[PDB]
């Protein structure tokens, strides 16, 4: 693996489409220049073998129904059998099923650390961990946990970690999450201020998705708001298609003209089918390889990256040699 | 038979939605709200056999395994954006030209003597059945018809009809309009829920998980709860009903009817079912 | 009288075209009058000024130094409301509003008009007196409930509320907060106003140019597709003759003025006569 | 003198102004700049252009007053009868005449506030922000939240003559005023942000501008501790009278009024804010008078963080009293 790597990325990227490319180019320079918000999902939890919403809806089933549901588990069921329960069954119940699985303690996948080698402005994120936030502390690197209308008001710093969704930092309960059928139809009006500083974020950022699927109800919710705001007011967001099947080119052409920006992963590698941990690994040790220059082999990359990076100061009379180090990150 | 002797195996509750259902007739305050169900009961074609032939055209492969809950909504969507609406309306006329014959369903709708009908679904089988029996009624389908009736016996059609030309724009099958239906459809939407608030509703050919079911539900949870009815619905799945579905979808205020602990019948004869709760309800006169 | 002979001839098409309409309406029981404070101002009834001004003597302890602000008629109650108490605040409401009036008989004409609905605005029972001396059993809708206790089908929609259940602030919409919390807290009055209007002809007697609640009506059409409503009808009764570039405003909106001082001349207080002339014209035709 | 003009002042406005100082020195103050600071020295204010309005659309001068709902209804109505060129060309003629800046803006630039947030739409805040030398991000329309260059955003929210003396650009009409979250959805999202996120004080509003009242129906669904009462500096040449005082505390305005502050005369709007302006700004530089009771409780405030560590040297105590 040690050369294998490598290689690989360099085959890679000297194939890759001029789009994918001009993506790389546009997320590194959003990168650098401290603007790039993240918007990790479900799957990168799932990266770490967390606790899954199929699970726990599965267990919800057996429970409340006397046995998991026949066939497909998959038809919006997500958000209606919990609900049941919860009127059902009532709190302790609900909250006991909660704390049964959640309470692990889990080791950090390695796909968190290259999501915050990216040097991110803010992390929007949705789901309910307790480790994403334990990767960004043990680098030196702060963020302003926002889970609650109430940590709004009193964040400190300047970078924010948004748990749109909720987190179990506040305990276990079953009210300080957005689980049940009642709180997605009532998110707008429960939490305000968490989707006032959401639309602020992706409005005033370069927004890339990583960790969701082409279908799932927030992309949607998101996209809705994005065709209601105007004609050509935001930065285009930028998603990370990791699904294992190639996208067909039709639901490419539908979502990138509803207000997307597709990165497929499944297309420039060809793994096999679950790969999760690589099809993640390729794009953002792409996105990493582009931070720090490890895709350049002709001279004019070379002379346009040093041009890129002293001429802002062609307009200073002389500069010294020893802060000409700080010009070139050390 | 056991359709006399059903009559002392009702449940209480049972017995009291049949004699409330017959009061409301008999007062002529009863609105009846159809679906899919009793359309694709005479052999109509259903939504996801154009799902199927949009997805064949725009996709190329079959049907690609299990679809989701909003694929139903989202395929039309692809084919519309690139391909345009020249395919979809002609793929619309092809599929749904067919006029297929009125099921005894309908018959005994009308048979009732309801005060209004409320239909969501996109076919003229109504139309058809209420010009054979001689019931007059009203066509309400878009905007312009809401001021201009002749009598106040409303065909509230929520979701439009091929009327007007089998093209797009006048009946709701898409996503678009399915977020801009309130938007799009200010008028009858309100027509609708006065309907609901003044008259009773019984649900008919419905699934307890249908889009339409569910959002009437979102807009009936912040009314007052003395200050509203309580619709009846009548499921016709081929299973029997558990009790926690029964307590959720109670205390969200649709009555229960289940054919399914009334009559044994079998998986694939809905027509047995609908037609045994049909007659149980007439019969009580 | 014996003048309105001539007065015939002098009003162009465009109030002939509307008193047709009127009449024709009338004629197929398809007219709902929208009436509120300005017929109710005829019988010495308590104005909201009057009110405003009691509030303003309790809170800030002196009369009123020059006139209301347009805010102030809805925020000086309010200010009641919050500072002093409820009780307090619905005390002046229990010896200043329950007063004994008579009808006045612009009151009893609109009824011999024969509507098929009233919807009215003011908080009084002088349309409710008039409907118990004349004997059209007019279901009362004042309340939420009411609504689902609806005996005929000819609604005297109060929107705003009545003092039936008692001279409580929490049955009439008075406060600032209950006019902004008002589709909240009145969904089935709001649908059932909404359908009335749409699905008949709607003819305002009695209102100023702009208040609050043409406003917000004029809005909700004005959130219609161009051809969905018929224009409602506005019967002005200010002393001065209405300007026609404002009229014209008015009429783009989806408005059809008759004014009352183009129609007559009259003094500065005489409101009787002045809709006494413009219903004669009506009912006379 | 002024030394026991600070001390003649209400607890609640003592607290006050130490809390706006406080945000200020943290980089958390935002400022909310409204209509009556514009027209402190000589800018127009809206009554003479809906007088004009009336003049070139009703023939006859304004008789009476007209009612709060006319002074966007006679535009409105302008608008619809005559056209926009009209409208245009009225607006270009009133808003072209430029005026020199006033000291109050000075002394709003001078707290150096996170944001200021104003619905003017002159650049008086904007031409003193240049001339200062302190550089704004300007956000007028909804196209410059994306090409924000800054971080820090002179926000105007009801639109500017930037590009041009047109109507679409401003709100000044009914139906801009009413369509606006269908119209500007990003900048209201940005103004709602940033009044949640940080402190805002309220300069020039009189309680009977439109903004103020949508601005506390908004407060009202923020649950209860999740937001922040803002600030309100009132410049009425008339006293609170203690009961609106209450309501709008109870709504969520803690209000300073400069009627009570200093006795000046009806016509004094530029000393009725300047006062109050000078009062903020001299309590940025020093606390107030202090008593046994609070000098140890202000040690401890800058010495209770040093007690976790085990030991400071004593060089570096000057940094901790900022010399």
């Known amino acids: 693996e040690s050369k294998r790597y490598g290689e690989k990325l360099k085959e890679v990227f000297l ?7 001009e993506c790389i180019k546009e997320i590194t320079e959003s990168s650098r220049n401290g603007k790039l918000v993240f918007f990790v999902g479900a799957g990168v939890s799932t ?8 699970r726990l809806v599965d267990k919800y089933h057996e429970e409340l129904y006397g046995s998991p549901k026949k066939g497909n588990y998959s038809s919006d069921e997500y958000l209606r059998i919990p ?8 709190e302790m119940a609900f909250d006991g099923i909660l704390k049964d699985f959640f309470q692990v303690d889990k080791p950090t996948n390695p796909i968190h650390d290259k999501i915050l080698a990216m040097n991110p402005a803010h992390v929007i994120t949705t789901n309910y961990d307790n480790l994403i936030d334990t990767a960004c502390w043990k680098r030196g690197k702060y963020f302003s946990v926002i889970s609650a209308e109430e940590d709004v008001a009193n964040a400190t710093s300047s970078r924010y970690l948004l748990k749109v969704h ?3 930092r506040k305990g276990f309960k079953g009210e300080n999450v957005v689980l049940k059928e009642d709180d997605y139809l009532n998110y707008d009006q ?11 974020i992706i409005a005033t950022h370069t927004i890339v998705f990583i960790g969701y699927g082409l279908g799932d109800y927030n992309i949607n919710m998101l996209l809705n708001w994005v065709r209601k705001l105007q004609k050509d007011s935001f930065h285009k967001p930028f998603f990370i298609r990791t699904d294992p099947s190639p996208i067909e080119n039709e639901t490419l052409i539908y979502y990138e003209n509803k207000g997307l920006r597709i990165i497929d992963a499944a297309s420039l590698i060809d793994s096999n089918e679950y790969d999760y941990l690589e099809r993640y690994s390729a794009v953002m040790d792409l996105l990493i390889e582009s931070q720090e220059n490890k895709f350049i082999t002709k001279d004019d990359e070379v002379i346009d990256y040093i041009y890129g990076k002293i001429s802002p100061l062609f307009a200073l009379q002389y500069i010294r040699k020893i802060d000409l180090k700080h010009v070139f990150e050390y």
């Open 15 to 21: 194939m890759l489409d001029n789009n994918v490319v």
């Open 47 to 54: 990266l770490s073998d967390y606790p899954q919403w199929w």
């Open 83 to 90: 609900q049941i329960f919860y009127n059902v069954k009532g």
């Open 166 to 168: 909720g987190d179990f």
């Open 190 to 200: 429960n939490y305000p201020l968490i989707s006032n500083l959401m639309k602020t």
